[PDB]
Amino acid sequence: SDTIDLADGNYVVRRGDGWILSRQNQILGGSVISNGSTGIVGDLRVNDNAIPYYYPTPSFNEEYIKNNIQTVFTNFTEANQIPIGFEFSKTAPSNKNLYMYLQYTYIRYEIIKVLQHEIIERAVLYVPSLGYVKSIEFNPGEKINKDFYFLTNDKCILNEQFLYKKILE
Amino acid sequence: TQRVLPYSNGLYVINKGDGYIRTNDKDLIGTLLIEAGSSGSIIQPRLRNTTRPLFTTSNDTKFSQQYTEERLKDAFNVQLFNTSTSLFKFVEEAPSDKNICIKAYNTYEKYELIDYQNGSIVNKAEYYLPSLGYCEVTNAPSPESEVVKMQVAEDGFIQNGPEEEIVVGVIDPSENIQEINTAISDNYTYNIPGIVNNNPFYILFTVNTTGIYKINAQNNLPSLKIYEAIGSGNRNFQSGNLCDDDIKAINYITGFDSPNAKSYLVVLLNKDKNYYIRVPQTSSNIENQIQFKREEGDLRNLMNSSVNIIDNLNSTGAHYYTRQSPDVHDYISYEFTIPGNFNNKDTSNIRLYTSYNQGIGTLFRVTETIDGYNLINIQQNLHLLNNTNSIRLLNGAIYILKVEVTELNNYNIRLHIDITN
Question: Which of A10, B10, B145, B348 could join A167 via S-S bond, C-beta 3.0 to 4.6 A?
Fold first, then answer.
């Protein structure tokens, strides 16, 4: 639930790497390879595609979240100004068709207010990190599950973390 | 001989799949002839703030390219610039024996923006977002075999990617959004402000405790619609208060577009989710309120559906009522009062049936007690489509028929209440 074993106060939290956002699965397109061909897809995280997403709360506005997160954790305002590229490479089996689509992954940061061992307020920051592809073998006309294309709620493809530090007054 | 679309009135964005290419090789990147034992690759690199997409529209003034891009951003948060920074590359090594050919095509992702109103598409726009290509590999075509004369296949598109149709409703941008800053307890009354001034609008709100809620306007007028914000509540949270993620993508839950039908909504709402309530155009300056009441009684046996309030059931004979038919496995409710004086012994023979859409119906006797409304089942598994069966009901009593549509043959559902005796 929303109950945590922490003393009262404000905390900065790193939830880990590999967070993909809802409805943002095929925002970048995909490749269709077949019959032994190798498909390679890559991207470059610079500025406008490295925009961090803020979700503030009345206690924790943008400046608060940014300053706290950058003080304790990776400094993203200067890091996202440095272009980082990445690539994926899949190889389709013989006489079969494979579709691969790529989406951005993010770092999840949280600013939480804890009172009586329960979180009463939480603000969320997403910092662009890298990408991730999902691939499926398909035939012409085959129905494809809705879960492959569409993500309903933000989830972490990796192990979620909880790296917390108490915010000093 | 098309399909019936049970979409509520509004704006919808449809992801029709990936891997679309134009006919007559208009998107042909090219063909590489790799010798035996060698390797080959086709690379399609892209620049910054480039990559022209493909856009057509039925009404440029309303569905302009800027408008379509903003709606696409509302639905899936796509931006053309995102496709600019991408690269794709196809690598193929030919075997030792024979040569190999590889053909590369630039692909597109097909998005469609539709203005759905009363069972038809009044405005349609097609957007094609540059995708990450399509590659097909063949054995080396031995020159020459023959050359066979063929004709062009005219303008059109060919999808090489998997089948896909993801439909997402989006908030109408022209309609205002008012926020309820406080989470909803067991009871609340929203007074519609004069700022919007009779124009249809949305109410964004959340719920304190998960449960089944009755939402209605004054005298159940006008009919209200409810949507759920997709992916809401996973982000920034505050206990007992509303946190707007500015999510425009919505899922239609229930509601009637017809502003004159007396109706109230019974819906299961989640404290970890955000919801919108669309109230339509009101043609008067007369005040109105939205009432929110958490239900703990038998009314929870109506979720999730709009209950339609029938007033013209005051005589024997033929009566039928037309509403926007819900989708398959989606519910619609009717609350009606048999004509005559209620003396607990006078009965009238009632026939309930639908005209085109088949649905399974369950009717309830309603006896309002001092604890609230009490719903008593008196029949189950009623097949409404051309139902010839009749049941005797008490004159002056109140009944609620909940219908689950099991076959959609018409955009509208017609419930007939025939009264003899």
Answer: A10
Task: For A68, list phi and psi in degrees, rounded to 5.
Answer: -65, -50
Selection from A121, A30, A90 nearest residue B20 by Cα: A30
Report how far residue B236's alpha carbon sits from residue B247's, in angstroms, rounded to the nearest whole number: 13
From CA B369, how far away is CA B391, in angstroms rounded? 25
Among the listed residues B263, B267, B293, the one whose alpha carbon sits nearest the alpha carbon of residue B279: B263
- Write the CA distances from A157 to A49, A126, B3, B277, B338, integer angstroms: 20, 15, 37, 33, 58
* Amino acid identity for residue B298 in this structure: D
HSE-CB at B377 with a 13 A cutoff on CA atoms is 9
Q: Do A41 and B236 touch (CB under 8 A)?
A: no
Q: Distance between CA atoms of B333 and B265, rounded to whole angstroms? A: 9
Beta strands in B35-176 (DSSP E): 39-44, 54-57, 87-93, 100-105, 108-117, 120-130, 134-139, 157-159, 163-170
Fill in the amino acid letter for A6.
L
Provide the shortest C-alpha distance from residue B91 to chain A (in Å).
5
Distance CA A40, CA A88 (A): 6
3-state secondary structure of A62: helix
CB-based contact B236 A122, cutoff 8 Å: yes
Contacts of range B139-142, beta carbons closer than 8 Å, 24 or more positions apart: B139/B98, B139/B99, B139/B100, B139/B101, B140/B33, B140/B98, B140/B99, B140/B100, B140/B101, B141/B101
Beta bridge pairs of residue B185: none
- β-pairing verdict for B372-377 and B382-383: unpaired
Asked whether the beta carbons of A144 and A138 are under 8 A apart, the reply is yes
Backbone angles phi, psi at B155, to 5 degrees: -70, 145
Mutate to test the interface with A, among B89, B235, B246 (most CBs of A within 10 A): B235
User: Which residues from chain B sit within 8 angstroms of residue A121, using beta carbons?
Assistant: 237-239
Place of tokens 């009522």: B321
What number of other Cβ atoms are within 10 A of residue B412's Cβ?
15
Q: Do B82 and A28 touch (CB under 8 A)?
A: yes
The two structure tokens encoding residue B348 = 């009238």
| Residues of A in Cβ contact (< 8 Å) with B238 | 57-58, 120-122
As a whole number of angstroms, the distance between CA B115 and CA B172 comes to 10
Structure tokens at B367: 């006896």
φ/ψ of residue B68, rounded to 5: -65, -40
Q: Classify residue B18 by its DSSP letter.
A: S
- Rounded distance, CA A141 to CA B328, Å? 23
